[PDB]
Amino acid sequence: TFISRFAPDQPRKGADILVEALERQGVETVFAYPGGASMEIHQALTRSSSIRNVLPRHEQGGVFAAEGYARSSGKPGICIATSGPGATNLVSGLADALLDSVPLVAITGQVPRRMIGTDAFQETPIVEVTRSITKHNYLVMDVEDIPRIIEEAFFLATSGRPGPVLVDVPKDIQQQLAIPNWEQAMRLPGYMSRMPKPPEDSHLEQIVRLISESKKPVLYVGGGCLNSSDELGRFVELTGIPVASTLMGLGSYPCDDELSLHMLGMHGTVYANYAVEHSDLLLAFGVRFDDRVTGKLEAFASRAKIVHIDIDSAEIGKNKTPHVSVCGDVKLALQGMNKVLENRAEELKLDFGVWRNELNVQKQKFPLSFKTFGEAIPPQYAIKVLDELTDGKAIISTGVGQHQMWAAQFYNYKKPRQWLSSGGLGAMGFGLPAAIGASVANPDAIVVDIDGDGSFIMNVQELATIRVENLPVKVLLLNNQHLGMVMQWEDRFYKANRAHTFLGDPAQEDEIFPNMLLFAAACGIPAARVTKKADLREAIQTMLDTPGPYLLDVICPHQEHVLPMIPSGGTFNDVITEGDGR
């Protein structure tokens, strides 16, 4: 039974109704940056004794923090911004949450209703701007609609395929007195009638039937399985099918497990891409067949019977036409299939040891490899050390680029929601703010931001947020003085012709620029730099043992290349396995 701070017959400001609507949704943390159009909301937040606000230093940091909060907990992330420039700064985060299907509720202030359309002070049609980069949005036109719209916003953001929902609130609605009706019914008749039903038994029996008839099955696991780690692990026990995971699905099935094929796709392991290439049964659970995974669609699983389970019917058959399809929650599909596999276990006699041995040969002939040049620190090795010293229990957020791939390749994530990374949009500057949101959602957890020097500086202002909020955020900064991923493509396809990919100072060309240690020093964050591989282990240990925030500047040779690499739109026979920028 919820307890209000107001009487059931007492009028209150619309902003106070909005905050209570968040309290009734179980919201404990918001990321709000104040402004003229949202000042009433911020006043109402201070009257709440249960909602904590983490003030960022940039609204993009606010929405990215809301993402990390959501990605690391399953709860919806809530960020608030003012109208105009505050709202437009949320754009990259909204598009990022939509492409990666992250539950998020963004609240933006707006000019009063009578001013909409007049090009008023700090007015942008944020609903028109964000309509194509949000799951849904609203423009509240009456204070009495606040309880209903907030309930619909959280329902849409978290149900079905999760996504971002934006609620635009005019300032006059925030100031108007009203008595909220919390028993309003939601006006989502179409969306609720099309919600996927629990999977039929006839569909699940035919999938188990296809498993016993297959000799080379491969699990194709993605972000849709982040809530099915137990059901998926039970499914792999009953079948013994090797598991190939996407960038978004890392952690659903443990990386250090005997049956793990690790990541597949453009930068996936050779054996994972080999397994999908020569498979006859592809179990696509919670994936969307991204071009970064498939390459040339006609050659992707060209001789496999494809079973696609997805909660979004618009995804089934979008890029790759499956033989069998199940539109529903993969968590329930795994539960129903696990029941069938237990009863008919001895009847089925499932054994893929010949297929597993064929893959284990590829796993030992073509494993993930990296060179060690003198005393220079290999970035892959630094992430390996961080894995050991944290026992693989840390929450990892990354930016975008070479460091992002190495953090996916060389860290053994044991559970889902340890891996917070922008995969669909691939937005730089995601790492640091996402670590902020993950730390607030998991206060007793090890949170490390494996960032690149280009991505880290984009939202470097959030170092102030880390210090003020006293968050134990660790920053493992893999510094190669370059936009490394674009540099790698320059080496491969443009004769190593540098086109504005160097991030240092050409005048002092051999100096580490910028001095990231002084960025942390400006925000009272202890920091250190390591250059030689011998000192790396003690440096990372110092970062972990030092209470509170810490920044570790890890200098890496820039000529490293992420390997292996299937060129964009290529096939498995086009995979690149050797070479760098030397």
Ligand SMILES: Cc1cc2nc3c(=O)[nH]c(=O)nc-3n(C[C@H](O)[C@H](O)[C@H](O)COP(=O)(O)OP(=O)(O)OC[C@H]3O[C@@H](n4cnc5c(N)ncnc54)[C@H](O)[C@@H]3O)c2cc1C
């Ligand atoms: C530089 C860079 C390189 C990259 N290279 C690679 C790469 O080599 N390999 C790679 O895998 N990725 C790579 N990506 C990431 C990438 O572009 C995509 O994000 C990823 O490939 C697609 O993830 P996904 O297939 O799991 O679908 P997601 O984006 O995770 O979406 C989840 C899917 O499952 C469905 N779903 C959601 N919930 C449920 C549920 N409860 N039940 C059933 N279904 C559900 C959704 O409808 C959706 O179709 C790279 C990204 C970057 C930035």
Ligand SMILES: Cc1ncc(C[n+]2c([C@@](C)(O)OO)sc(CCOP(=O)(O)OP(=O)(O)O)c2C)c(N)n1
């Ligand atoms: C807001 C934004 N702007 C430009 C981007 C285009 N990209 C990249 C990519 C892969 O998305 O291109 O497809 S990666 C990248 C450079 C990465 O700099 P780093 O942080 O130092 O990482 P590293 O360890 O050195 O490689 C750029 C410029 C991007 N994604 N986001």
Ligand SMILES: COc1cc(C)nc(NC(=O)NS(=O)(=O)c2ccccc2OCCCl)n1
């Ligand atoms: C790690 O991914 C990266 C990283 C970097 C730095 N640069 C590229 N370069 C291309 O991606 N070139 S592209 O094939 O024309 C292309 C561009 C944009 C979207 C899709 C696409 O593929 C379409 C063919 Cl299916 N890829």
Ligand SMILES: [Mg+2]
């Ligand atoms: Mg870099």
